[PDB]
Design an enzyme around this catalytic site. Structure first.
Site, PDB file in Angstrom:
ATOM      1  N   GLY A  49       0.827  -1.048   0.188  1.00 22.51           N
ATOM      2  CA  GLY A  49      -0.088   0.091   0.041  1.00 22.51           C
ATOM      3  C   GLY A  49       0.915   1.239  -0.003  1.00 22.51           C
ATOM      4  N   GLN A  79       3.718   9.835   0.660  1.00 21.23           N
ATOM      5  CA  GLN A  79       4.984   9.645   0.485  1.00 21.23           C
ATOM      6  C   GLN A  79       6.004   9.555  -0.625  1.00 21.23           C
ATOM      7  OE1 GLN A  79       3.285   5.674   1.868  1.00 21.23           O
ATOM      8  NE2 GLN A  79       5.455   5.392   2.478  1.00 21.23           N
ATOM      9  N   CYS A 110       6.858   0.091   6.689  1.00 16.56           N
ATOM     10  CA  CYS A 110       6.504   1.162   5.994  1.00 16.56           C
ATOM     11  C   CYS A 110       7.713   1.749   4.953  1.00 16.56           C
ATOM     12  CB  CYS A 110       6.490   2.570   6.752  1.00 16.56           C
ATOM     13  SG  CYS A 110       5.983   3.996   5.881  1.00 16.56           S
ATOM     14  N   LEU A 111       7.603   1.839   3.897  1.00 14.35           N
ATOM     15  CA  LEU A 111       8.563   2.233   2.365  1.00 14.35           C
ATOM     16  C   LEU A 111       9.430   3.229   2.932  1.00 14.35           C
ATOM     17  CD1 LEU A 111       5.999   0.955  -0.097  1.00 14.35           C
ATOM     18  CD2 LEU A 111       8.201  -0.381   0.297  1.00 14.35           C
ATOM     19  N   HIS A 139      -3.124   2.138   8.229  1.00 13.94           N
ATOM     20  CA  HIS A 139      -1.823   2.313   8.234  1.00 13.94           C
ATOM     21  C   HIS A 139      -1.556   3.434   7.266  1.00 13.94           C
ATOM     22  CE1 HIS A 139       2.827   1.512   7.346  1.00 13.94           C
ATOM     23  NE2 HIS A 139       2.432   2.370   6.698  1.00 13.94           N
ATOM     24  N   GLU A 140      -1.953   3.211   5.965  1.00 13.06           N
ATOM     25  CA  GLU A 140      -1.879   4.214   4.943  1.00 13.06           C
ATOM     26  C   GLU A 140      -2.855   5.597   5.290  1.00 13.06           C
ATOM     27  OE1 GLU A 140       0.322   3.544   2.486  1.00 13.06           O
ATOM     28  OE2 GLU A 140       0.332   1.433   3.205  1.00 13.06           O
ATOM     29  N   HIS A 173      -0.637   8.248   6.894  1.00 14.57           N
ATOM     30  CA  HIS A 173       0.054   8.852   6.125  1.00 14.57           C
ATOM     31  C   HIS A 173      -0.536  10.310   5.671  1.00 14.57           C
ATOM     32  CE1 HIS A 173       3.506   6.560   5.942  1.00 14.57           C
ATOM     33  NE2 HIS A 173       3.020   5.540   5.289  1.00 14.57           N
TER      34      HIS A 173
END
Ligand SMILES: [Zn+2]
Length: 164
Positions: free
Chosen positions: A45, A50, A90-91, A132-133, A136
Site C-alpha cells: 500500500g 510518501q 513502511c517504505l 496504516h496508509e 500517512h
C-alpha cells in the site's frame, strides 16, 4: 513512472493531504504512477504523501500477484471496532518493523480512479493496511505509536542505511 519515496527524516512526510477536488486524467496518471512505485518498491500500500504529492490518494494491493488493485481517493472512515496488531513496516521507514494498535474491522467510503463512490468493509490485514496508509494522509507515522526511546532508535537506525 517509479517516483521517489520520502524517507523518515523528512517533514514532507508529516504534511496533511488536501482533498482531490475532481478526479481527472492527471489524477489518474498519478494513481498509476503510484501503483508502479509500489510494485517497484515491493510494497502492499502507498499513500500520495510518501511520494510528495500532498492529496488524499491511496493505492493498495494485498494480493500475492498484481491482481487486486484497490484505489482510495478521498477515503472517509465510517466505522471501526476491535483491536489487533501486526509487526508492520513502511517504505518510508527502511527495514524497521513494529507492532502497533489497530482496529480489527474498518468501514470506508471513497472514490475509485474513475471517480465513482464505493464502500468497503475491510477486516484483517486489509483493515490494518488501510489504517496504516490513511495515517500517512495526515502525516502520521506508525513509529509515532512507539515510546520516544524506540522512535529515537528507529530513526537513528534508518539514517545509517541512508548514508550507506
Ligand atoms: Zn507507510
Amino acid at each position: 513512472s517509479v517516483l521517489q519515496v520520502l524517507h523518515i527524516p523528512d517533514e514532507r512526510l508529516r504534511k496533511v493531504a488536501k482533498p482531490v477536488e475532481e478526479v481527472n486524467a492527471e489524477i489518474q496518471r498519478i494513481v498509476d504512477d503510484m501503483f508502479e512505485t509500489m510494485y517497484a518498491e515491493e510494497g502492499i500500500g502507498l499513500a500520495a504523501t510518501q511520494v510528495d504529492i500532498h492529496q488524499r490518494i491511496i493505492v493498495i494491493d494485498v494480493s500475492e500477484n498484481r491482481d487486486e488493485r484497490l484505489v482510495l481517493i478521498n477515503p472517509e472512515l465510517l466505522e471501526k471496532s476491535g483491536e489487533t496488531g501486526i509487526e508492520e513496516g513502511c517504505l518510508s521507514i527502511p527495514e524497521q518493523r513494529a507492532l502497533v494498535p489497530r482496529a480489527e474491522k474498518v468501514k470506508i467510503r471513497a472514490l475509485d480512479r474513475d471517480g465513482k463512490p464505493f464502500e468497503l468493509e475491510a477486516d484483517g490485514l486489509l483493515a490494518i493496511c488501510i489504517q496504516h496508509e490513511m495515517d500517512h494522509l495526515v502525516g502520521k507515522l506508525f513509529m509515532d505509536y512507539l515510546s520516544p526511546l524506540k522512535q529515537q532508535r528507529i530513526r537513528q537506525k534508518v539514517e545509517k542505511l541512508d548514508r550507506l
